[PDB]
């Protein structure tokens, strides 16, 4: 992107295998889900009276990103940031939507996930198939908790909460694997151990920009997040600050 001018829509990542769209539209009474490779079948949820989760996997299909973006009223410079997967997590507020860029860890792998909250949709953009959001899927499907009774702002909370819980499970799992490898002096074990330590180092770097995002979502929130949902965002934020540093 060094040569390219502002506004150039180019995917900068390494995943060009998968493409699918997955929709879950729900209310108190019912839910509906489907998978498709036909972008025209997701456009009508823009105007839905009930909350929709649209998940687009394979942003290498920049034609599909542009189609969805232009129909949903997403500014071209936001579409540029969705496709540019080499950037620091951040949150940006516009009049009709909230834009969030996060990292998702899932043989440790990173991908960028973008989320757009409108009054009735969460649009989620991913690089490759596989995510940490199955527990939210399961709550929609079997009507567990309160997600089916709430709006898209609570859907955003639920997705970010799943990501944050997974993050803290993951780095506990990495600490345990590292402790075991150290009880184990073969060349493969040593180089592997040093690999897992470098991985743990990159995991813990991402807490700082994530805390900036979580802070903005509960302190002077914009109108697309309702007063009643703010306490849920405050709980996700609070969960990141529990083992505080000490000066002594």
């Amino acid at each position: 992107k060094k040569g390219l001018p502002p506004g150039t829509l180019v995917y900068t990542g390494k995943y060009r295998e998968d493409f699918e769209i997955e929709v879950m539209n729900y209310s108190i009474e019912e839910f509906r889900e489907f998978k498709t490779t036909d972008v025209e079948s997701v456009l009508p949820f823009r105007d839905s009276s009930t909350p929709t989760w649209i998940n687009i996997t394979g942003i290498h299909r920049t034609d599909v990103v542009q189609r969805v973006g232009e129909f949903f009223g997403i500014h071209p410079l936001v579409l540029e940031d969705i496709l540019n997967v080499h950037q620091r997590p951040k949150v940006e507020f516009f009049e009709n939507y909230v834009f969030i860029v996060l990292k998702m860890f899932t043989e440790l792998e990173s991908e960028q996930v973008s989320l757009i909250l409108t009054k009735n949709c969460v649009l989620m953009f991913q690089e490759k198939i596989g995510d940490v959001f199955d527990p939210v899927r399961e709550r929609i499907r079997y009507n567990r908790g309160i997600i089916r009774k709430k709006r898209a702002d609570y859907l955003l909370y639920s997705l970010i909460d799943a990501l944050v819980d997974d993050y803290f499970v993951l780095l506990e799992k990495i600490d345990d694997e590292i402790d075991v490898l150290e009880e184990e002096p073969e060349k493969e074990t040593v180089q592997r151990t040093h690999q897992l330590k470098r991985n743990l180092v990159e995991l813990r770097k991402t807490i700082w920009p994530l805390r900036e995002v979580l802070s903005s979502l509960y302190r002077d929130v914009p109108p697309l997040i309702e007063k009643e949902t703010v306490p849920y965002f405050r709980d996700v934020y609070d969960h990141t600050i529990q083992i505080a540093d000490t000066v002594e």
Partner: antibody, heavy 130, light 109 residues
């Protein structure tokens, strides 16, 4: 410095085809979004098609979708509208136009304006006949 | 599912020196993504105003635009002879792009 000049308008029959061209000078079409807008005799402005030239991404009004193809030749610096399956309601002055937007990146509240059409050619007349 | 832009009036009559007001109403929120264009007989449209209220380079300051929710107004503070013309509003928030019907500013007699 910036100029769009449309050409290629004339008589065309249903069954036939017509290619309109928009020659751009003072800027490179490669990094631009180019539009066709038409006006039927005594009527208003109607958007037809747009091309984001860097990716070749194209957009069409439902009234032309599947009949007209927009394209850009980034070595001639020229956009085209290829008109097929002509109908009497396609009779109109066709205008080419460039869009722009103003912005500043950064902060939690980025200053992002949506595009408008700064530069227009003087239009080319397409007359559909039996 | 296209956004409709309802422009009024289709025509109005005015004299030189009049304040003229032209309205456009979006069927849904288009944020501020509204532009205004002038067109004279036999000529291409010319941009006057973008993002509801930004005056385009070289356009006289007697043209102003404003917004209230989904209501958009073009104002000519003091009409001059060269301002008898057709005006169009356009939203660029959603694709497809949609134009108002137009307002013809005619000579009062």
């Amino acid at each position: 410095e910036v100029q769009l000049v449309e050409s290629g308008g004339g008589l065309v029959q249903p069954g036939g085809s017509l290619r309109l061209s928009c020659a751009a000078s003072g800027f490179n079409i490669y990094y631009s979004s180019i539009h066709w807008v038409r006006q039927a005799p005594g009527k208003g402005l109607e958007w037809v098609a747009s091309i984001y030239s860097y990716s070749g991404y194209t957009s069409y009004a439902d009234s032309v979708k599947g009949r007209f193809t927009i394209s850009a030749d980034t070595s001639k610096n020229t956009a085209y509208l290829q008109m097929n399956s002509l109908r009497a309601e396609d009779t109109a002055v066709y205008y080419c136009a460039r869009s722009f937007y103003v912005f500043k990146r950064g902060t939690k509240y980025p200053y992002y304006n949506y595009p408008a059409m700064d530069y227009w050619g003087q239009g080319t007349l397409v007359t559909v006949f039996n | 599912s296209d956004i409709q832009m309802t422009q009024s009036p289709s025509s109005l009559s005015a004299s030189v020196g009049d304040r003229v007001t032209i309205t456009c109403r979006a069927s849904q929120s288009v944020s501020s993504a509204v532009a205004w264009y002038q067109q004279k007989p036999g000529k291409a449209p010319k941009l006057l105003i973008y993002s509801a209220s930004s005056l385009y380079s070289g356009v006289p300051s007697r043209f102003s635009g404003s917004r209230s929710g989904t209501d958009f107004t073009l104002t000519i503070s003091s009409l001059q002879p060269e301002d008898f013309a057709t005006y169009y509003c356009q939203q660029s928030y959603y694709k497809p792009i949609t134009f108002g019907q137009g307002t013809k500013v005619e000579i009062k007699r």
